Design a protein around this ligand. Structure first.
Ligand code: CLF
Ligand code: CLF
Ligand code: MG
Ligand code: MG
Lengths: 515, 461, 461
């Protein structure tokens, strides 16, 4: 049934956005509202539609000048806050561009300014011949025609290609409207405009993947170990001109359905490319995902070889953590897709009890998937605000939350540890290895001896009379383990190094024989 | 010679600052029982709360009016009205509520002063008659100035709203500028030693908040309504940072005749000496021997470093203009050569800064000061015009230049997110002079080891 | 598991410490109006004054008996007699004069207690009858122990000399150990908050001396004769560092029945908690809210770093045994893996240390604790036995291992001469827990940027 928060009784519209998965309830009984307007003054977790378009989907493209047409603030505010990496020396993290719209441009427009900026940027970055221009609140409102100015520059400079994304912050209630806008602009303006070199019998688009801490490189590792040509990644570690050849893929492999279902759906309608939805996280969801892609291309034996090898390498480490995490409570409090990617498999494979999930900007489709996947009792929230998050911490008393940075720092004050679900701690978290890293970070957060320390009141006359000047994580975690578990000769802590991704970049892949 | 010049490019590549509302939001988070409402799109507040999180690793309370498409077409005062109701209805302890404009709401011309008038006579009387609630308009269009000028505007807006002169006293108003808790602590130390009471705008030491066993603490400012009212009753206003405190100081000078002492920013020994001299002048209090001793302790630390290691080091500096200029002055006292200062916004008054004219009069090595600067003004000079640097002083957003061009960098200013704990240490005062000089040395020293550049010399200095 | 083993080689390659006399000299520079005479060859004192210069960049007063060839053949008690006369005759304010033996004067067997008794009855009565002058034997042969054991001995000898129980009181004796001024400050802050008065051995905050305009200041200690005498009247002796204050603490226990609380070294949150608990127990005073607040502020800083960056870092630690052990303990609470601890002298009592027993009971990964260690025990392991480390913690003499094998290093202990200002910061207490954790992080961060090792991750932690 629906759930009301004490703190939101005065705004009863909120009751529609939360449900507790009740005994015997199905998806036809209760589902939160989603993708509605935000309540002003609520202290909602939500961002703008420029965020959704430019900051989340656009900027990951690794070989592109990402220029926001507007005042410098929108640009500064999205710079050096993301961990989408690339094998183009993190160009997309290191360089950002703003038109620096001023007062005089409000009356008269900023079209000339836009053009001068484009020329200046191509001049400063002669190795870069691709560009996306993102509209902001100010340039939407003053009405500059960005598409015209881009065309005007593409005429004059036939060596460059410029994409236009008209997704200002106020265009919709959240991130989500920005997702839709940039998907549809891309397929309309750009898909079909490049004929690719094909180098294999088996061609995919990898869609809805943004390469946080190397997630994409993890997954493309597996694909290349199967002799699949990844034609495109939308958009993590992705190439602008690669993504203009999406119309030639054999299969759309969709991880983040929230952000990228729009383009997969239109790619089916326009070109008859089928949509297969996958999970990048956990052993079973990933094994299933890879098996399916294998079968599809009639190379299932190659998938099974990867799966067996990876599971043999890493399961003894995942299960070490599972034993220590069994029954610990967790809130999956990302913005979107991650809540349902993790919901079931995190309980199964890590032993955690999911007590809450939330989405900042998700649709009712995301709560379908989330509620479908969690257990009864779970509290699901659409468009959470701060007070509601705080109240849920007091009511549910989770051992850890997985959430954003600043939300995590709210929880810190009330003695709830966090991992950054968005940017990760020691990522990447996709893949078999990544799943273990994920588990270890959760283990380290829950059984932190500093956390133990922080709960002790030293003014209190019957205080814990400390003996040694330390407690190890294991002293805090292993006390009530069975001897079988404590003495296992197979179970061990994570053995990978600090950076699990740089090895992948230096790796040669066996070629396969084309028909 | 030292030449002031304006960036040639019209566009921005790698920005040094964000926009005016960010500054107004920063002022706001330093006031007790304050929650500002940022009138515009959701990113205008959420992204800024993240900037503050990057610097302090703490969450501060700020709200949105949540502009959507309707408001952008029809006007959006309704969203402000609903935001105030929803905020006050769910946060019973809030007493100050800034209403902070953005690019969008300035452009659509929403009448914010009018909507405050309406709530004061309407909602606040009807629904909240027993509560003190101060609604304060802050006009901060993002298409002029920067977060720096936005801070300047906000301090004036807050002081204008509260200040009354109904009980004149011998306190000063200390407008710190946009500084770290460690600077507040340092400045209050000096006042304590000078035996001077002050209204300290702002009291942000409580930003450094505990995890307590009962989970009861939160990060917050401690500048009270009472403090802000009392700014009207002071004998002088000390605005340390010209670009962050001039508007507020001059408002009080014109309205209440309180003399305003604007700057200099007390960075380094000499600028600190001037501060203490200016405090003596304005209060009649003498400079005690304790501060002379502390001064000499700081001088001793500097004496160990200056001619052996700091002399003739080529430095580039960016960040808040008052920080940039104060650091350049101190660097010169340390025998260093600041060769490039970036001032990363459109302020037309830099060319009139007396501190800058002193630099123009007195420097005769090659030195550039670039106005309306961005980071490409630095990177381009290194990459393509052969600029040689021993050291950068600036905030964390410049970091990739340090990292990729192998120039070491001391993190100063705001925000400093790629190092831990920097907010607890001072850059102003005598304590700050020590910290800056010793951390510059330690930065240089680690670099010497990394590069094997006479690293064996760090034994008997 | 955690294996304690003795260094295999009989010889020393790259020593971690110097000899016992250096520790006695360090004790002596911490006492007001004290100038030790080092009875031996000139280098035994002049080289040690340089050590202290390397750490502090200050000069401290210490004299030589200037042993030459004749005294080495025939005995050199006369060289002492002349020294005392020449020192007293030219330094009117001196009141305390340790007589510190060296390898030479121990081997040739000079009767120091003898020659002191002679000077007390003789020279001091005849020539200096109006003056207070305390001559104190310190038997510090260089061919046993180290500077660390020399320190222990000297603290005992000074307390033994002076301590009388005329007027029992409620003060404690706080034997800080061989620590920095920033530690003394921190410890004094903790005592102040507990409202516990103490005789603080030693008051070395005044080592950080100014350059005054009248050139009148000098580095000196402020532990006085009165304080040293008053050690007999205390209700307990807190010897923080077992290897540096056990002898003096037990002496007062055995002689005056003053209970000795030996350790643990208050490094880290947990060990600071035990200190405060032990103060409560000893004095009956409650632990105030204010320290729970400061503790939580410290924990907050640690929370930002522990599971993100410090967890599972592989650490080697060397320096004073109390520091080494204290650090190892705090590192484990920070989720780190100290894998090699060097204890760089012949103390046979390390294996009996309860803190080391706890490490043996509780550590569950590969760790080595090497007794009688030298720096080759660390370098050989890196170079030839594949030891992998993320961080070193230790004093500057180990620096070439850091520099040449690309392992970053935080400077802790004594001496720290290849960085500036470190003596002003705490390693003990809640303030020191902040400093250690944040500076380990900052050290790791700089290294990640140097090596391009996920340097891009330092944005939204
Ligand atoms: S909702 Fe989003 S981030 Fe906000 S403005 Fe709009 S697109 Fe941008 Fe931009 S310059 Fe500053 S931060 Fe705003 S006030 Fe304008
Ligand atoms: S005058 Fe010179 S430095 Fe002195 S001992 Fe003699 S050769 Fe040597 Fe050596 S071990 Fe220590 S420092 Fe001395 S007390 Fe002996
Ligand atoms: Mg904090
Ligand atoms: Mg000094």
């Amino acid at each position: 049934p629906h759930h009301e928060f004490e703190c939101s009784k005065v705004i009863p519209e909120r009751k529609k956005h939360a449900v507790i998965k009740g005994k015997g309830e199905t998806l036809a009984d209760a589902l939160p509202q989603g993708y509605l307007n935000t309540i002003p003054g609520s202290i909602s977790e939500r961002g703008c539609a420029y965020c959704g378009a430019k900051h989340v989907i656009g900027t990951p493209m690794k070989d592109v000048i990402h220029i926001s047409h507007g005042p410098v603030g929108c640009t500064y505010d999205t710079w050096q806050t993301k961990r989408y990496i690339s094998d183009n020396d993190n160009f997309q993290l290191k360089y950002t561009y703003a038109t620096d719209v001023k007062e005089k441009h409000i009356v008269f427009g900023a079209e000339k300014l836009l053009k001068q900026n484009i020329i200046e940027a191509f001049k400063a970055f002669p190795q870069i011949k691709r560009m996306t221009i993102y509209q902001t609140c100010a340039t939407a409102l003053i009405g500059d025609d960005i598409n015209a100015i881009a065309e005007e520059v593409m005429e004059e400079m036939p060596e460059v290609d410029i994409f236009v994304c008209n997704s200002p912050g106020f265009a919709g209630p959240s991130q989500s409207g920005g997702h839709h806008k940039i998907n549809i602009a891309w397929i309309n303006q750009k898909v079909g405009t490049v004929e690719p070199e094909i180098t294999g019998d088996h061609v995919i688009n990898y869609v809805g993947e943004y390469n946080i801490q190397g997630d994409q490189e993890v997954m493309v590792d597996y694909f290349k170990r199967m002799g699949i040509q990844v034609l495109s990644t939308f958009t993590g570690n992705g190439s602008y001109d690669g993504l203009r050849a999406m119309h030639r893929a054999h299969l759309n492999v969709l991880e983040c359905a929230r952000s990228a279902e729009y383009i997969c759906n239109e790619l089916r309608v326009r070109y008859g490319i089928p949509r297969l939805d996958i999970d990048g996280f956990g052993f079973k969801p990933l094994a299933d995902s890879l098996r399916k892609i294998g079968m599809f291309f009639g190379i299932e034996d190659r998938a099974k070889a990867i799966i067996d090898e990876e599971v043999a390498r890493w399961k003894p480490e995942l299960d070490w953590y599972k034993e220590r995490l069994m029954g610990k409570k967790v809130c999956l409090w990302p913005g979107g897709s991650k809540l349902w990617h993790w919901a079931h498999v995190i309980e199964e494979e890590m032993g955690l009890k999911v007590v809450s999930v939330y989405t900042k900007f998700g649709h009712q489709g995301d709560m379908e998937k989330g509620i479908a996947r969690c257990g009864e009792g779970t509290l699901a929230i659409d468009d959470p605000n701060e007070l509601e998050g705080l109240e849920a911490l007091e009511m549910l008393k989770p051992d850890i939350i997985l959430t954003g940075k600043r939300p995590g720092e709210v929880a810190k004050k009330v003695r709830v540890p966090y991992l950054n679900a968005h940017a990760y701690h020691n990522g990447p978290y996709k893949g078999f290895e990544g799943w273990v890293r994920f588990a270890r970070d959760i283990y380290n957060a829950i059984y932190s001896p500093i956390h133990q320390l922080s709960g002790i009141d030293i003014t209190k006359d019957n205080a814990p009379e400390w003996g040694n000047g330390f407690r190890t994580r294991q002293m805090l975690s292993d006390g009530n383990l069975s001897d079988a578990v404590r003495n296992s000769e197979t179970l061990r802590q994570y053995t990978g190094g600090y950076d699990s991704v740089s090895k992948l970049r230096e790796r040669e892949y066996p070629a396969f024989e084309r028909k | 010679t030292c030449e002031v010049k304006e960036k040639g490019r019209v566009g921005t590549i790698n920005p040094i600052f964000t926009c005016q509302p960010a500054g107004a939001q920063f002022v706001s988070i330093g006031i007790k029982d304050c929650i500002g409402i940022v009138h515009g799109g959701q990113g205008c507040v959420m992204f800024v709360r993240l900037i503050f999180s990057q610097h302090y690793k703490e969450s501060f309370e700020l709200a949105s009016s949540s502009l959507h498409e309707d408001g952008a077409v029809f006007g959006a005062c309704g969203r402000v009205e609903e935001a105030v109701d929803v905020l006050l209805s769910r946060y019973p302890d809030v007493k100050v509520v800034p209403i902070i404009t953005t690019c969008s709401t300035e452009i659509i011309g929403d009448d914010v002063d009018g909507v405050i008038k309406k709530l004061n006579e309407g909602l606040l009387k009807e629904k909240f008659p027993d509560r003190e609630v101060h609604l304060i308009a802050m006009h901060t269009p993002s298409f002029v100035g920067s977060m720096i000028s936005g801070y300047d505007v906000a301090v004036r807006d807050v002081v204008r709203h509260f200040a009354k002169r109904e009980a004149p006293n011998d306190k000063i108003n200390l407008l710190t500028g946009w500084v770290n808790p460690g600077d507040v602590k340092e400045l209050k130390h000096l006042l304590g030693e000078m035996d001077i009471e002050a209204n300290v705008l702002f009291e942000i030491e409580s930003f450094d908040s505990p995890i307590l066993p009962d989970g009861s603490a939160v990060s917050h400012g401690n500048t009270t309504i009472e403090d802000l009212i009392d700014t009207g009753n002071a004998r002088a206003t000390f605005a340390l940072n010209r670009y962050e405190g001039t508007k507020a100081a001059e408002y009080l000078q014109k309205k209440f005749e309180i003399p305003a002492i604007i700057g200099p920013t007390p960075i380094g020994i000499r600028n600190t000496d001037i501060f203490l001299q200016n405090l003596k002048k304005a209060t009649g209090k003498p400079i005690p021997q304790s501060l002379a001793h502390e001064r000499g302790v700081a001088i001793d630390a500097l004496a160990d470093l200056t001619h052996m290691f700091l002399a003739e080091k080529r430095v580039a500096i960016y960040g808040a203009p008052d920080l940039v200029i104060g650091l350049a002055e101190f660097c010169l006292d340390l025998e260093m050569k600041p060769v490039l200062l970036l001032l990363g916004d459109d302020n037309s008054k830099y060319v009139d800064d007396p501190r800058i004219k002193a630099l123009q009069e007195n420097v005769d090595y090659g030195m550039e000061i670039v106005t309306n600067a961005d980071f490409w003004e630095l990177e381009n000079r290194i990459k393509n015009e052969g600029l040689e640097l021993d050291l950068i002083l600036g905030h964390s957003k410049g970091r990739f230049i340090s990292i990729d061009y192998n120039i070491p960098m001391l993190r100063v200013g705001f925000p400093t997110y790629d190092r831990a704990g920097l907010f607890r240490y001072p850059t102003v005062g005598y304590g700050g002079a020590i910290w800056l000089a010793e951390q510059m040395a330690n930065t240089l020293f680690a670099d010497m080891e990394h590069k094997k550049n006479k690293e064996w010399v760090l034994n008997v200095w």
